[PDB]
Design a protein around this ligand. Structure first.
Ligand SMILES: Nc1nc2c(ncn2[C@@H]2O[C@H](COP(=O)(O)OP(=O)(O)OP(=O)(O)O)[C@@H](O)[C@H]2O)c(=O)[nH]1
Ligand SMILES: Nc1nc2c(ncn2[C@@H]2O[C@H](COP(=O)(O)OP(=O)(O)OP(=O)(O)O)[C@@H](O)[C@H]2O)c(=O)[nH]1
Ligand SMILES: [Mg+2]
Ligand SMILES: [Mg+2]
Lengths: 180, 418, 8, 383, 180, 383, 418, 8
């Protein structure tokens, strides 16, 4: 139980975060996860269950749960609400037709008492497409700034390039890192 | 085929359960228990029992009932041999097939069941594959496991599984290369009250312990091929050579296994090493009877007979018995009416014998026939049929390994009347 | 363990 | 204990593998003990994605046993299998297929259907073996996929490896007992492969071929018999009996005697085998007493024999009794009457190969044997 | 220089092999490499240079050089001939039109004095396609059995499934592993 | 030494990173020393794919310096960059772009063209800054891509971050000095951003705007001047001079005097600055002697001054001499004649802002300033 | 803009080269060397030199010529300041800007050049970014490097690079928070042969050493704002506050840097702390002249004058000199004809003075004018212009750091005639 | 190092 032993691990790197990743179908979640983990973009198929994977960055072990958003499985999200540190909500910046839907699901996430302590990070994904809305436009459509009593931030992203992904982790690092 | 498996403690308790296709209600065992209630004894339970739904197939052994649940028609022996094989596997992994062994190793046991049967049809089978899929628990292994983690499951397929020699492990390595062949003969006999042999036959088995590395080819030649008649051959044996040359060439599986099972030709007569002189009497409503038995060397082959156990199953009229042995130790069981006499061995110059009187129940009727006697016995270095091995010739490996052979004759059921 | 076996 | 249930969940939730492991062992033990651990499913299932090979093996156990009670949650753990299915490791693939195929959820049926097709095309025979078993499962799960599976089975029947052939035949026998036109295509092939096929497959194949032959025969007939012959020396009683069965219903009557020698040696095994074998002997001897009479003394009843065994031997002795041996058998019967087992004594005073006759009741799924056709089927199909 | 130190590493795993991977365009080389390395199949583009990556398997560090086969860069292969342990030649089992071409390039590889000590492993890739030839057919088309004085073997593969890839390494392991 | 060359290759070939590192340091040293290490290219280049960040940085150095001598082999190492370009790390991306863009091989031009478009769309400004520089390279590499690059430049000109704006303007200035219609679109924007733009960009932008204004002017004019004003207090002499330049050619003549104070303080710096600044002063004073005369004593020649400096000050003193100060300056000149520097003494007895006038030779690429248009361009374009 | 860089050893040797756009032939330096040959001295080399192809721009400093190669028109100062900045960077990283320092750190040097200039246009600039991109070499760091590998390059972008305060490092942390301001004034003066001041002006600079963590905001107030006239402000300074309040509020870069550079208002007269009494004579064709100089406290502010170096540049007629100091140490250089007199300090009660005779070349003509004298000197705790700092007020951080200020007046060029 | 500086 040597306190220094713990401090040693801590300085040798020993933080961890439980991050639940939810969103709608084709938001780009799976892609993001593996690009952060492997670096490369892998061939994927629609997710039924979930892929959990841990990405070590800035001495923090970010454990991310790739939970699928298909209606048939969507209710599932509730089984990951327990004990999270943060919530990543990925949005397709081109799918105008389902932005409100995404907003609703997000608000439902935000309505969960269990998740009140989680920080909210929103990814405006697929910025490399010509019809993509920018972060401000997405913010407005989602009404993220109407959120009260919660720590949140929106980050423009483009998983095919990798843009915004480390930035997302940097923001999370600062919000989750109360101290070194 | 097999939907589920229940292990039933002989006290009447569902010890352990395993389901492959669906959750079979434990209430199904009520029919087993009914049959058990209607059975004369634990050894008189009908292997196959029909219930309103599902058929039960079971094996009694080691004071434990293996009860399987069958949904549709399956050849009874298919199920029986498989199930029996499972029990043998448990003995291999834990050293003993018993509930206590299981109680300690439940997790492993459960896993073994998962590997062996796939949704009702056999998957993992022979021990040389199974031992690689799941490593057997040892003290030293558990020590390693406490450090590296409880890993007893392999991450690859045993190479031998996809070879043309599936019964042998690939990459076997020994520095002390050796092989043993234990030729054990079985004397199964029915002896008349006069001492005359009613029926006797010699069965036999050649067991083997193989510690040879790589891919060796063992070949056995016998001193008298003609003694071998009905002979079962382990699947590894290339019977074509047996058929044309009568030579046992094969790539041996390592570890312990039976190689040859056989019947000795009936053309020759069976030598019976033990005779039983036995004077015994009962009297209608008497408080006392008589008992005088002498065990000795009939056709003892010039060898010392040893490992002798004499068991008499007495009639209910017997209450006690004033009987003294000339050898070993003697105890009477009044609960089941059994004379247990530990003889040990027969001295060429001095015979084992029980001499005395029987304490009978006064007022109880005379037994319709005198009680029979079962005797266990054996002889070291003896192959009583005469079957000896002519020559072992190993190919494919550089070694000059121990080529050991042992001959032991061991009694099977030996029943003598009166 | 070899003790008791005959060489062949 | 609810507190313990919470502790189990804490360990399942914990990122410490040792904790996870312990929880799973406790859980499996509870499964073995028949305890209702369905409450833990929401938590246990999260670890299905764990990379700890030992732990996830245990998870598969749990998962399958409760798949039918938490169908929703089972659905919610499929992807890890579907992805694992494409892992470049034959062992893993096979196990992935197995645990995938074992999830009884209607929703994932089409997923598995695809997986089966992929499995059948797998270059390794190990996986193909598993594919066959998976077919059997899927069929029983959803009978409406039958035609698709039949296609797949036919394709599997065209393999050459014995590692696959055995299991495929079994799957065929259950899924599609009919459509014997799917068998003749590989008749001569199987007739040779049988020798190298593993004993469990041998039993199944032999029964299949026996009933096959009953419809096709009235050179290929002899091929079957000839290649079968060596099998009588098998270590596996089930094989021996299966072979005996085949000859009994297929062999020329003049050659039938060859099996009784082996049938007798089967009597040397354990009491379950003895029970079944004696029933087969008793059944056979009704038609051919001369096949067992030469071994008469082997049917003598001894004091260690269970009443039901004593009865069976007695029944055989009944058929084998005649004027050339009655002077001995009656004396034996007198002793048997003198025995304290009065049930046996009373019976004494009065004195093929499948489940159905051992019950003497048509068992579920009992296939009926046909009589030799008056006209044999056209030989171009390899009879 | 402790001999045991080396033996220690050796037993703790310390073998390595230089394997040059060459073939024609669209043979499937890149895919194979990353599937062995990462396990997943990654999105790829035509290779101009090369990707070198090391895959540890059975205590052997297999270093594989993904050298592109485009005519513009093809001559390059000669700069990797030096000091190899093995040669993997990947073949598209559906591209009938260029099998002879592949054969020629392979024979040219085989004609190199520097490579005479390398073992030859041929991958009959893309077995999951309906027009794919089997290993025997590929062997005949390539004439691999006409090769003399060289250690070679053909392995049917299907990188999209992963089949034949470990098998390939298993064969190589046996050929390269003169001793443990 | 050929043996050493072999040893270097052995280390390059070796799987030991320390060996690789040492070899690369030796190699870079040889590059710095002007030694011909092109022989090692075939070997060095293999390590371009190395994951050791320090080593591959060194490799990039080697690679670029010999890219033009082994074009074939350079081609043969492109993929690692192209793949690295998409790595989710802004630092890496930028460096990847740089080293990629530095490979002078005609064959990979279209590859880079695509990369430029991708770089311009990168969400991070850091990369966009690099994209601008890369454009400049590509243009000089292949002038026939100009129209494409112009499109990209226009797009980059629409950014708001100063981190990008500076470099983009530079790229514009070189690639497309013409097409001032691409500037007015962002005129008011740049006029404000200038203050926050980094000093190196400030210099470039100011010159651009100066010549811009010479064609657009004959409120927005004053915007330029007003926002520029504060810059006179900059630490960077180049900025100060650039500002001075702008006012000299743009400011109302009544306000011009404001810069001479700062021009004088520039004379306090080092001899290179002094040399250039004095040339600018001497040039300016020809038209406006009153701007420097108030500071006359600052132009006195001292014994530590280099002959060329002594000359320049003397030249300024020449223009600033008049009847109200000739009684002092001649006495100073007498002392100057008495000095042992006879070249200076003989000269004594006789007694804007760009390269071209400092040479007094039209320098390569010299843009010419126009005269104020008789009619100003239509103001709707933000003048 | 800048195609290449050559470092030329003042002995005439291409010390080191760097190419950004293409390989520039070393033969281009022949023109430099030509100019060097045609130059009166190393300090009289024209900063800009035109050659048949390419323009050379160079900076002479630290006995080293930085020579850059320019292809097309670029504002000379752009190049000069950049190049000069590079030299300053070398001093920062190695502690000294010299060839010897480079010879030892060649690899690092070469890398720094790569980071600072991108294909001819500046990329890495300010030291607070560059120090993070490439860590400076230290003994302890090299020890770490011998273990973990020679890693001095960061794997991420310095956060400050993308902030609105690029001149400051992000995440700065100190336990000993402190800040220093060194106000150094410069006395640059021309003194008449009579001792009268011809021209004098006070320039000045406020240097700063900042060791404050986080994102602090420093603010300086001066005792007499009116003394400040032409004032250059470090880019970090929010000049609007300076303009309306005359207060120096800013977020400081850490490390050492110049903050304020300024000219003292000419409205007030410059106090000259040193007077020079100097009697000197020469005679046409004489073998001997005279020399008598006294250095003392004119407007010495009541302070002790120290760090005094007296340098006279004598005419060629002087062969030697029989001259004795009343303070420090005196040496004559007959090679360059220089009187080096180390004074050290002026004692209020005793003045530094050189008294004696001059050994002249007989037959050589009398100098047209008596030789001039340059004098270095300084005063501790003195801000001779009167400019003192009124108040330092830090915002944004919890600390109560050392707020130190020092005033030192240091002579610039001080030339007195005869 | 603070020695020589005045507090302000
Ligand atoms: N254009 C573009 N496509 C993207 C981007 N990110 C992901 N995609 C594509 O979007 C599709 C869906 O991506 P996934 O990662 O499978 O989406 P998901 O959120 O995991 O979907 P579910 O598994 O159903 O929850 C794939 O074809 C991706 O390649 C992006 O930034 N730009
Ligand atoms: N159908 C099928 N396609 C495959 C298989 N393996 C690879 N491919 C596909 O073939 C195409 C080419 O694969 P690459 O790995 O890029 O081929 P390569 O050999 O690396 O090509 P170069 O880089 O030009 O040398 C891709 O679209 C792959 O997805 C396979 O087994 N089956
Ligand atoms: Mg997904
Ligand atoms: Mg490729």
């Amino acid at each position: 139980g040597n306190i220094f032993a713990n401090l040693f691990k801590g300085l040798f790197g020993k933080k961890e975060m439980r991050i639940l990743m939810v969103g709608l179908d084709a938001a780009g979640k799976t892609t993001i996860l593996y690009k952060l983990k492997l670096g490369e973009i892998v061939t994927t198929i629609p997710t039924i269950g979930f892929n959990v994977e841990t990405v070590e960055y800035k001495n923090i072990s970010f454990t991310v749960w790739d939970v699928g958003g298909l209606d048939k499985i969507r209710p599932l999200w509730r089984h990951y609400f327990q004990n999270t540190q943060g919530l990543i909500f990925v949005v397709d910046s081109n799918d105008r037709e389902r932005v409100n839907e995404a907003r609703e699901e997000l608000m439902r996430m935000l309505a969960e008492d269990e998740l009140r302590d989680a920080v909210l990070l929103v990814f405006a994904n697929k910025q490399d497409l010509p019809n993509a809305m920018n972060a401000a436009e997405i913010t407005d459509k989602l009404g993220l700034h109407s959120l009260r009593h919660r720590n949140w931030y929106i980050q423009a992203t483009c998983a095919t390039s990798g843009d915004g992904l480390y930035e997302g982790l940097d923001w999370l690092s600062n919000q989750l890192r109360n101290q070194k | 085929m097999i939907h589920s498996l229940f292990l039933i403690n002989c006290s009447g308790d569902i010890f352990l359960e395993k389901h492959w296709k669906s959750v079979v209600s434990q209430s199904v065992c009520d029919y087993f228990f009914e049959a058990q209630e209607k059975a004369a004894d634990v050894e008189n339970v009908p292997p196959v029992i029909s219930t309103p739904h599902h058929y039960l197939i079971s094996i009694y052994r080691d004071k434990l009932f293996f009860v399987s649940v069958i949904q549709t028609e399956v050849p009874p022996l298919f199920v029986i041999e498989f199930l029996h094989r499972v029990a043998d596997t448990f003995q291999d992994y834990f050293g003993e097939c018993s509930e206590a062994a299981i109680k300690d190793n439940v997790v492993i046991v459960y896993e073994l069941l998962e590997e062996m049967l796939d949704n009702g049809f056999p998957l993992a089978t022979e021990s040389n594959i199974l031992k690689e899929l799941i490593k057997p628990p040892t003290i030293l292994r558990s020590v390693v496991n406490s450090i590296t983690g409880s890993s007893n499951v392999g991450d690859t397929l045993p190479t031998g599984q996809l070879s043309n020699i599936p019964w042998r492990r690939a990459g076997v390595k020994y520095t002390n290369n050796e092989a043993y062949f234990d030729v054990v003969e079985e004397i199964d006999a029915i002896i008349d009250k006069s001492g005359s042999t009613v029926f006797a036959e010699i069965q036999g088995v050649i067991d083997a312990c193989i510690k040879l590395s790589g891919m060796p080819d063992l070949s056995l030649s016998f001193m008298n091929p003609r003694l071998l008649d009905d002979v079962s051959f382990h699947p590894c044996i290339r019977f074509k050579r047996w058929e044309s040359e009568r030579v046992l060439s094969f790539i041996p599986p390592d570890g312990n296994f039976r190689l040859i099972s056989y019947r000795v030709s009936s053309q020759n007569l069976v030598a019976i090493p033990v005779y039983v002189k036995h004077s015994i009497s009962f009297k209608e409503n008497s408080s006392c009877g008589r008992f005088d038995i002498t065990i000795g060397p009939k056709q003892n082959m010039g060898k010392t007979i040893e490992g002798i156990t004499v068991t008499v199953h007495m009639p209910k009229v017997v209450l006690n018995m004033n009987l003294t042995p000339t050898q070993g130790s003697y105890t009477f069981d009044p609960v089941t009416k059994v004379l247990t006499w530990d003889v040990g061995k027969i001295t060429p110059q001095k015979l084992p014998s029980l001499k005395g009187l029987v304490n009978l129940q006064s007022g109880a009727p005379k037994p319709e026939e005198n009680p029979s006697l079962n005797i266990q016995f054996k002889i070291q270095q003896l192959a009583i049929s005469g079957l000896k091995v002519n020559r072992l010739d190993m190919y494919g490996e550089k070694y000059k390994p121990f080529k050991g052979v042992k001959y032991v004759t061991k009694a099977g059921k030996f029943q003598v009347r009166t | 363990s070899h003790a008791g076996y005959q060489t062949i | 204990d609810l507190k313990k249930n919470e502790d189990l969940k804490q360990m399942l939730e914990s990122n410490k593998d040792s904790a996870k492991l312990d929880a799973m062992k406790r859980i499996v033990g509870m499964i073995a003990k028949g305890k209702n651990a369905s409450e833990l499913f929401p938590a246990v299932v999260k670890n299905v994605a764990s990379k700890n090979i030992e732990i996830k093996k245990l998870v598969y156990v749990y998962l399958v046993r409760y798949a039918e009670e938490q169908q929703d949650l089972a659905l919610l753990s499929i992807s890890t299998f579907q992805r694992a299915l494409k892992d470049p490791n034959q062992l893993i693939r096979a196990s992935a297929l197995r645990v995938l195929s074992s999830i009884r959820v209607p929703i994932i049926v089409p997923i598995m259907m695809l997986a089966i097709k992929e499995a059948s095309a797998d270059l390794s025979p190990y996986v193909r073996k598993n594919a066959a078993h998976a077919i059997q499962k899927l069929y029983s799960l959803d009978p409406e996929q039958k035609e698709m599976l039949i296609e797949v089975i036919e394709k599997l029947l065209k393999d050459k490896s014995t590692l696959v052939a055995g299991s495929v035949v079994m799957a065929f026998e259950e899924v599609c007992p009919d459509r014997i036109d799917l068998i003749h295509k590989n008749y001569r092939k199987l007739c040779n492969l049988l020798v190298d096929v593993e004993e469990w497959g041998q039993v199944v194949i032999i029964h299949m071929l026996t009933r096959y032959a009953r419809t096709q025969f009235v050179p290929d007939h002899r091929l079957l018999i000839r290649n079968t012959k060596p099998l009588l020396q098998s270590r596996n009683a089930a094989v021996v009996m299966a072979v005996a069965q085949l000859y009994w219903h297929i062999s020329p009557k003049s050659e039938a005697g060859i099996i009784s020698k082996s049938l007798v040696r089967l009597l040397r095994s354990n009491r379950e085998v003895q029970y079944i074998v004696l029933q087969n002997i008793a059944t056979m001897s009704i038609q051919r007493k001369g096949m067992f009479e030469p071994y008469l003394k082997s049917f003598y009843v001894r004091s260690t024999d269970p009443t039901m065994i004593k009865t069976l031997k007695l029944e055989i002795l009944t058929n084998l009794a005649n004027e050339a041996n009655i002077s001995t058998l009656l004396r034996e019967f007198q002793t048997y009457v003198k025995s304290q087992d009065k049930q046996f004594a009373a019976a004494t005073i009065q004195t093929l190969g499948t489940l159905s006759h051992t019950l003497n009741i048509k068992a579920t799924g009992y296939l009926e044997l046909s009589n030799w056709p008056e006209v044999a089927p056209d030989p171009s199909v390899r009879n």
